[PDB]
């Protein structure tokens with residue numbers, strides 16, 4: 470089948486988290502990874518990664534550092550979220566000078582010309598729908614407008630294969646991709662989600678937008 | 683100091699929750715509590731509480747029942763969110779007939795009216811800004827329009843005392859208010875949040891609106 474988007478940008482945020490009985494409502498991004506997937510060659514053409522220095526809870530709990538694999542010295546070495554969106558936009562602008570990529574709000578037909586369509590792919594509506602949305606509203610930051618529509622890969626998986634997977638790891642195993650060990654985080658989790666997305670593309674899945682704000 | 687609002691309605695929603703890493707599910711309100719605080723006498727003149735039956739994930743996780751203290755028999759005995767918003771509006775309408783309450787930021791006529799102004803008070807912008815907002819848009823429910831502006835008591839606390847509190851429990855402790863038992867949730871967290879507001883009122887804090895959505 471012919472794909473609608475010529476590129477996919479896969480994002481899997483890591484955030485502050487605790488397991489200690491207390492009542493936490495807000496979470497802060499601590500890692501911003503993204504991989505540019507080529508939906509016709511299956512290769513990763515570019516990558517972005519930044520460590521976000523949390524402001525509201527600057528000290529990572531032991532549970533968080535164990536779960537995400539991020540060490541305190543890395544978020545201490547990182548930039549605040551506002552500077553992180555700036556670097557992410559410069560990266561988005563760089564792959565546009567290189568790949569001639571545009572973000573369109575409602576595509577009905579694939580490109581037949583020199584332009585290349587692109588969309589963001591997440592494993593859930595949590596990254597761009599809850600995490601970055603509430604934090605941008607809470608910190609009153611200017612959120613890039615192209616991050617308001619994305620592809621929920623989990624919903625796409627549930628409908629293309631007609632089965633509920635046991636997480637992102639369970640999804641990879643059910644299609645023959647067997648990986649063992651600790652749960653991957655950050656950029657490594659983004660690469661694995663892109664590996665899943667590319668496998669679904671080869672199986673005949675047409676990636677379409679699932680959420681709009 | 684003279685207060686702007688004669689009554690405050692304090693809300694502390696409880697919702698389904700999990701703590702298991704990159705496994706994010708949708709969350710649904712499971713308790714809708716509210717206490718009517720009298721900002722001149724410091725007393726609670728009325729209370730509202732309802733247990734909400736979650737539809738997308740009806741079975742409370744062990745982590746959720748541990749954190750909130752809410753048992754499964756209570757949410758199975760409760761009503762869905764749509765019916766709960768209906769009951770909450772009936773309560774708001776009852777306390778307006780009773781207390782002569784309107785929800786308005788200011789009276790423009792000179793004081794020829796015994797009418798009483800009211801505002802909603804929550805700990806952080808999460809209750810009415812994230813919890814009830816995102817769930818109403820996802821379930822395509824009609825959210826009461828008076829729930830679009832509220833007082834963020836934590837922001838009011840950070841500015842009135844010039845210190846960052848470690849949650850509602852940490853905030854109450856710094857002013858001497860010590861409670862025993864498990865971390866309060868739902869109606870008990872609503873009563874204690876109203877106690878904090880009354881402490882701030884007695885210390886001379888004028889409660890103002892902090893967040894608006896309309």
Ligand SMILES: Nc1ncnc2c1ncn2[C@@H]1O[C@H](COP(=O)(O)O)[C@@H](O)[C@H]1O
Pocket residue numbers: 487490491492493494694695696697698699700701709749750866867868871
């Ligand atoms: N540590 C936490 N992890 C995940 N969710 C939480 C945590 N603490 C509180 N919540 C959620 O926040 C809601 C409100 O709790 P409270 O802050 O006590 O009013 C709870 O019902 C949970 O859904």
Ligand SMILES: [Mn+2]
Pocket residue numbers: 694695805
């Ligand atoms: Mn709360």
